[PDB]
Ligand binder design. Structure first.
Ligand SMILES: *[C@@H]1O[C@H](CO)[C@@H](O[C@@H]2O[C@H](CO)[C@@H](O[C@@H]3O[C@H](CO)[C@@H](O)[C@H](O[C@H]4O[C@H](CO)[C@@H](O)[C@H](O)[C@@H]4O)[C@@H]3O)[C@H](O)[C@H]2NC(C)=O)[C@H](O)[C@H]1NC(C)=O
Ligand SMILES: *[C@@H]1O[C@H](CO)[C@@H](O[C@@H]2O[C@H](CO)[C@@H](O[C@@H]3O[C@H](CO)[C@@H](O)[C@H](O)[C@@H]3O)[C@H](O)[C@H]2NC(C)=O)[C@H](O)[C@H]1NC(C)=O
Ligand SMILES: *[C@@H]1O[C@H](CO)[C@@H](O[C@@H]2O[C@H](CO)[C@@H](O)[C@H](O)[C@H]2NC(C)=O)[C@H](O)[C@H]1NC(C)=O
Ligand SMILES: *[C@@H]1O[C@H](CO)[C@@H](O[C@@H]2O[C@H](CO)[C@@H](O)[C@H](O)[C@H]2NC(C)=O)[C@H](O)[C@H]1NC(C)=O
Ligand SMILES: *[C@@H]1O[C@H](CO)[C@@H](O[C@@H]2O[C@H](CO)[C@@H](O)[C@H](O)[C@H]2NC(C)=O)[C@H](O)[C@H]1NC(C)=O
Ligand code: NAG
Ligand code: NAG
Ligand code: NAG
Ligand code: NAG
Ligand code: NAG
Ligand code: NAG
Ligand code: NAG
Ligand code: NAG
Ligand code: NAG
Ligand code: NAG
Ligand code: NAG
Ligand code: NAG
Ligand code: NAG
Ligand code: NAG
Ligand code: NAG
Lengths: 105, 436, 442, 116, 117, 441
């Protein structure tokens, strides 16, 4: 599952199908809290799909976009923390690029 | 900047974990999800993760859940408000040993019955700890008219079972397998799991009973070791066995208190009356402290004298070792254990115990449970798995450190097992520069 | 070879499954407590040609779920009602003798007692009538208590709640389907060769009774006898009749209701004085239909016990009225009728009046931590019901020269709800699968 | 809806839309209904994600780059697409479902990484 | 958002796709009503996506398909329903028989798939 | 040769009845720490209540069939009732009380108004005493509390505030709220200046009768609105163009007497009064009221004739909830007379003082199976409120006359919300268009 977390950014790209499937596949009064938890889990799933939708990456695990070269000595949980402060800019740019791509329709 | 989905990353997060258990018990009727007969764990090669057992929200959740279940279990039960009446006691002197003189009293009183227009006169025994003399000798219960006293239901068991906490989808629990981890900082050899191991919700004070043992020497964990305001949690390598008993062959009278309600009164003791007590192997205890002392010297100096002493003060919940054995509530004197000075250079220890029925559970003022009596002789065996210690405020003006038993806050008991676990939220979506 | 995997979504396959079913119904009843779901005007069946499927009325999922839902609704309806706990007082009870017929001489008591009032510093003296089944002696002397004052709190059932059964249609959500068996004699278990798919059941009235099943479905053409391990006495026998038998029941006394305020917004409904003379409650079964009906059952029954023997009927075994008598709920009144007048016969291989008892304190789900008080009804009761089936048991033993004695049985409500829901099963649709074809590349 | 259940495998292929239409849709009662709606969504999404992983999103029928292994079944196409139905087929290859699915996920993973 | 009633223009349908960003923008007593609302928002989203999928229009805002337009539905030619009529008015004109058009769209996509697979 | 094409993102909507969520701004729950409104309507809103103008859209509105009103009414009731569930039940007080009159430094306007009652409170009894207002105590010198024979009295919890804060109702995704911006809109029919919003402007859930306090004002003129102005069974809601300031006080400096009645169960009784005992009252500017009422008449004549005499008169008999200005000031419950405000005939020194009664046992929302006890408030109460609208009714029988009579009245509560929600409508968005008709593939 998360076994590739400590390897390298490149190699970990080969386990994307494992992680994607495992996040969706998984008396009653106090239990309302569990019902709320189930609904929230569904919304989290859809939130990611909805971002892929507006960015034009729907249905993909590896999406090519329109917006040094290491990928060996750095891993996920390192590199992605370093760009935490830049990431929101990127997300805005990904949406903007798709908004312009949509002109051709 | 390529978009990837299914990326193995996460961030620390606080969520609600659900309880699961292996296959009338308070946790069994809650932790309804069966556990995996063959749980799996995933080793994460080359993953270093920062752990902090003193900031672990899993502990705070467990604390809240244990209290909530306890209180919910006591809701559909008998209120003992109808019993807050003047009681009339005579000391019980019927073949009672010296150490039990004055411990039991026999009171008569006027209580309710099946019909609201009838009353009955009954007699019952009380432990002195539950009864206050009002200045024949007139008595009332402790906090008779200020606390809400609820009878525990005879049908519910509070025996701890090894309950597991499991992650909801989108979350994972990470374990620190480093055999010497001291509760804070980076940990290598991190694994991903779906559920914690089974943790028995054992309630105790000075000594931590049952649960796990350290594999490599005694491990001493504290938040701030030089700060006397903090407790020291000491994990042992081998357990110390304790044999405890309530030797008196007591009986139980189930009497009617209302239309569909029963009250359980302590009846005449069938056998002779003796003091409750716990047995600790003497050699085992002495070896155990020697191991603890060596590890303490590593923090306090190899030329420092280590001394053990009893509790500095407080009420029974912190000055005695308290525990529950089969529903009975014990308050044991540990001054017989923590009495030595350690120099750098077939017997047993008997700890006398007191029994009390009205319990100020979780240290809440005004809320108490009445523990019904249990008939027959009660025995239990337990494992000391760890100690809670504090140090005297002697500053630096000493060549000797004095350690005393701690206790009180329950969060520290639960931290003894939930120290290797961390909860993280999985964030599968991310981006990276690629040649595309 | 050259065959390749092709994936198909929307494939017509399924597996047995347990799911949550929800209520639907047609145009203050406890059986429709926000059942704001219409049924289809046409709950159209989809026939499945060439499909044979296995059914099992026993070890089903729908029966247990129905049982659970009924108890839950029952309790939810009683939660917001007046507690009668304050009425567990000593009663001063004497005999009701004025215009009482012989059959009723000792049946009713006239009890006076102290009762609470709106204010805490006031008390009132009241009286009411009780059926002897609800009142017992405290020690020996007119001092009596209610039967459940040493067991549980008694909750008064709320007025304006009829509890009259409404056919309830159980519906499967989304990806689940209910399959129905259209055979005439499927006999409880095994393959059914004529089946169809439905979204909701036909509508089952939650009638609560013992020994005889009232207002259910009839068998087509012939009597059907269903039992698990029928050559045993361990399990009961369910007999579904192919014709109904009418049973005419009554509470002939013109009873009244005495409304007594017991607290600040709480009322107790007491049995008041009776207008006119007092007679015994009873049920009438016509001999003209019963003897023939029973003979048909025997002919069908004598398949499993050999085709050459004597079948006898006898009365029920000892036990509580909830199992030994026939329980009815007519107008909200609770009857406990004597069926020994029906089950008394010898069958050789060649108007019946049943007296009834009435109770006001009810424990119908075989639980004693709860009890209900049924308010009196201010009127005279008559009801006519359709006997659509029986729950029977048989004596055990061996060396009795193949002599078979059958007796009324049941009392376990889950078996009443097997007289319906025997032809239905729930399956999970699993619309995704693969198969080979001539499609070599994506 | 399931009217095609007794038809042959190649016949039932014409009702895939019919069934897809009703897989998502078609105070004790209140809570049961809410729980039922949540379940319907969860099951629906699990099946759709799986088609997405396999690269079949948006299609009722898709072919992939996975050869049929000769050990999964030993039957002719004239015997598979006719002369039997999907209920029978599902039982016959039941023990390989998780194998085939794992292969489908891997085949698409390779197809996708190959595109950069 | 609902920025126009400027006839059935259709040149700026992108603006109302913000309702497809509906989840991205996100003691229990009456919290049930709020929970029901969250569940329904999810179902509405999924139902529209399922329907576009089954018709072969998924991923697009403007889907040109294989079902011919009938005179039995509306016979207003084109300028009347493009330059002079609004979307609200158009929806009223074809308010009836939408289940007919939808059913035809599903049949068409099924045929397109069987002819390829 | 025309073909079906499918469009997603089509600007089409339909009337709808849905569940709106309740929201508040980001300061409301930081300042109003124990306020039920801020606590439960916890979703942050109003960073920018941006409107989308709808060019060329005519939309039909109807304020008297508006589901938003019914939802708000239910939400207010539900929250109120939930808030009282864990509060102390004052059942030990349903005992006979022995009372005498308070005659200590009392004015002439309150003789017999306050009573000093004592009773034996719950094997032990304790004689206790407290002060009560006349309205809460009924003779049976033996007395009992009102609402002691039909319902239980629940003490409101002193730790929770009900002080109104603005409430915004917000559309769930898939829905939108349309606003009518036409000025001088009378609550019904087509509106041509229309815009779309995510949430309402923020309504304070103020509860009052006869005079509506702290609402919004009309932009240009007084607006008279009714379901059917020619009927007599309908109320007339008058939205004022300018606010009228009303200054209310409870001049008596009260103390609180805490009595324990169980294990952490406390009852709060009025202790005694410091200083002189005086009548509670409200003041309005006389000149402002006169001009305000004249404006109401000018815009009322339009429906009755400009040669028709308009007179105002006070309320009909009935319970205080409908005959007086039911009003909450400082947390205390006031019932002000108002007859000094509605006493004139209109033909084509500077203030008015309204005496007010105080009551502690309150039966809210016109229900009778529940009662609430309001704990006493210590010290002296003063508040200033804005009169933003009136609720008037019209006497029938005017057929045989040239004069119409208007009276204050109405206590249905929904009308207090119709007066703010009248400009909003909820619509469902239907983004999928099926066949504008254009091309083949
Ligand atoms: C640390 O772990 C040890 C175990 O390793 C644990 O000691 C065990 O406690 C249980 C419960 O107190 C003991 O089991 C009881 O034994 C008596 C013997 O007569 C039984 O009567 C008890 O039965 C109850 O439940 C029945 C349910 O049907 C009732 O019918 C019956 O009347 C009783 O209510 C029960 O089986 C067990 O024997 C000990 N183990 C040993 C070795 O003695 C210890 O308590 C844990 N430490 C702490 C602090 O909890
Ligand atoms: C109409 O709105 C006005 C405010 O614009 C409301 O009056 C205000 O009410 C609050 C709560 O009753 C008062 O708060 C108090 O402030 C004093 C300050 O010394 C403090 O000691 C008290 O404990 C309390 O917090 C506030 O002062 C008051 N504003 C004014 C100008 O007096 C009014 O109640 C609203 N009308 C209605 C009917 O709700
Ligand atoms: C079986 O069905 C009959 C017919 O509906 C039930 O008897 C009727 O109950 C209603 C209740 O309002 C009365 O108004 C009718 O007058 C009754 N019918 C007759 C002939 O009097 C009967 O109660 C049902 N059986 C059971 C056990 O519930
Ligand atoms: C209300 O009545 C009580 C008695 O029920 C009065 O209390 C007494 O006041 C005198 C004043 O000199 C004291 O000496 C007594 O000790 C008080 N009695 C008790 C029981 O406290 C009280 O003053 C009256 N209050 C009002 C406003 O009339
Ligand atoms: C309402 O108006 C009255 C005057 O009509 C105010 O009462 C006066 O208050 C001053 C305060 O210094 C006293 O000197 C006067 O003697 C009072 N006059 C009368 C007739 O009693 C009253 O305070 C105003 N109320 C409010 C809420 O502002
Ligand atoms: C861990 O680090 C060592 C360093 O020599 C490297 O050889 C090994 O491949 C790394 N493990 C993983 C999972 O990449
Ligand atoms: C019970 O009540 C009687 C009443 O006379 C009293 O004498 C007796 O002392 C009471 N019992 C107790 C234990 O107080
Ligand atoms: C440890 O305790 C000392 C005082 O004894 C304090 O100065 C120091 O900051 C503490 N360290 C941490 C990590 O809190
Ligand atoms: C306690 O006394 C009873 C007397 O009947 C006896 O049966 C029981 O075994 C005794 N139990 C013990 C532990 O001595
Ligand atoms: C009076 O009640 C007793 C109760 O045991 C009963 O036996 C007796 O027959 C009754 N007398 C009548 C009805 O006259
Ligand atoms: C009929 O039911 C009995 C019940 O014991 C069973 O044994 C028998 O096999 C069933 N018959 C058929 C044809 O399934
Ligand atoms: C039963 O039959 C008897 C015959 O005399 C008749 O009087 C009675 O009314 C009948 N009861 C019912 C319920 O039909
Ligand atoms: C029940 O009553 C009907 C008339 O309502 C009558 O025709 C029928 O014969 C009666 N049944 C019995 C068993 O007496
Ligand atoms: C059932 O089988 C017959 C041939 O025996 C066939 O004509 C018919 O179409 C089949 N039914 C279904 C649903 O395919
Ligand atoms: C839909 O059918 C009704 C039938 O009464 C008719 O009045 C209405 O005009 C029709 N609408 C359309 C769009 O054809
Ligand atoms: C209080 O004073 C009024 C003045 O009219 C009088 O009628 C009433 O009887 C008095 N009540 C008491 C309790 O003194
Ligand atoms: C309290 O009870 C006694 C009982 O004798 C009575 O005399 C007294 O008047 C009561 N007091 C009150 C205030 O009701
Ligand atoms: C509304 O107020 C303005 C002043 O702000 C005033 O000029 C106008 O005349 C008022 N409206 C009416 C109807 O009098
Ligand atoms: C209300 O009080 C303010 C001062 O707080 C004063 O200026 C104003 O004139 C008063 N209004 C009325 C109607 O008395
Ligand atoms: C209304 O005013 C008249 C005097 O004009 C008075 O008699 C009547 O009681 C008043 N009614 C109310 C409710 O204020």
């Amino acid at each position: 599952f998360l076994g590739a977390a400590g390897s390298t950014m490149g190699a970990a790209s080969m386990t994307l199908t494992v992680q994607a499937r495992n996040l969706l596949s998984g008396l009653t009064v106090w239990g309302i809290k569990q019902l709320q938890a189930r609904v929230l889990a569904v919304e989290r799933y859809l939130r990611d799909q909805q971002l892929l939708g507006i960015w034009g990456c729907s249905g993909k695990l590896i999406c090519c976009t329109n917006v040094s070269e290491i990928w060996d000595n750095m891993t996920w949980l390192q590199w992605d923390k370093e760009i935490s402060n830049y990431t929101q800019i990127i997300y805005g740019l990904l949406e903007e690029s798709q908004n312009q791509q949509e002109k051709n329709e | 900047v390529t978009v990837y989905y299914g990326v193995p990353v996460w961030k620390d997060a606080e969520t609600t974990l659900f309880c699961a258990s292996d296959a009338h018990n308070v946790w069994a009727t809650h932790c309804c999800v069966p556990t995996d007969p063959n749980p799996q764990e995933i080793h994460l090669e080359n993953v270093t993760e920062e752990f902090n057992m003193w900031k672990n929200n899993m502990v705070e959740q467990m604390h809240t859940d244990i209290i909530s279940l306890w209180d919910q279990s006591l809701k559909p039960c008998v209120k003992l408000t109808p019993l807050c009446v003047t009681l009339q006691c005579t000391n019980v002197t019927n073949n009672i040993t010296d150490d039990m003189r004055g411990e039991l009293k026999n009171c008569s009183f006027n209580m309710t019955t099946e019909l609201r227009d009838k009353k009955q006169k009954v007699y019952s025994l009380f432990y002195r700890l539950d009864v206050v003399q009002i200045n024949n000798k007139e008595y009332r219960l402790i906090n008779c008219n200020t606390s809400a006293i609820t009878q525990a239901c005879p049908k519910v068991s509070f025996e701890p079972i090894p309950i597991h906490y499991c992650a909801p989808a989108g979350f994972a629990i990470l374990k620190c397998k480093d055999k010497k981890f001291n509760g804070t900082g980076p940990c290598t050899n991190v694994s991903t799991v779906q559920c914690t191991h089974g943790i028995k919700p054992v309630v105790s004070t000075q000594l931590l009973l049952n649960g796990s043992l350290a594999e490599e020497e005694v491990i001493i964990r504290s938040e701030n070791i030089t700060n006397n305001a903090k407790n020291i949690l000491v994990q042992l390598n081998e357990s110390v066995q304790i044999n405890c008993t309530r030797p008196n062959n007591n009986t139980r009278k189930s009497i009617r208190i209302g239309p569909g309600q029963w009250f359980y009164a302590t009846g005449d003791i069938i056998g002779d009356i003796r003091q409750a007590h716990c047995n600790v192997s003497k050699a085992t205890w002495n070896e155990t402290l020697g191991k603890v002392v060596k590890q303490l010297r590593k923090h306090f100096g190899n030329n420092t004298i280590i001394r053990f002493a009893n509790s500095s003060g407080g009420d029974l919940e912190v000055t005695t070792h308290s525990f529950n054995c089969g529903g009975e509530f014990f308050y044991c004197n540990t001054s017989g254990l923590f009495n030595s000075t350690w120099i750098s250079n077939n017997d047993s220890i008997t700890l006398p115990c007191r029994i009390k029925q009205i319990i100020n559970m979780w240290q809440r003022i005004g809320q108490a449970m009445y523990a019904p009596p249990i008939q027959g002789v009660i025995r239990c065996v337990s494992n000391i798995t760890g100690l809670i210690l504090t140090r005297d405020g002697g500053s630096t003006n000493s060549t000797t450190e004095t350690f005393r038993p701690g206790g009180g806050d329950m969060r520290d008991n639960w931290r003894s097992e939930l120290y290797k676990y961390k909860v993280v939220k999985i964030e599968p979506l991310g981006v990276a520069p690629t040649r595309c």
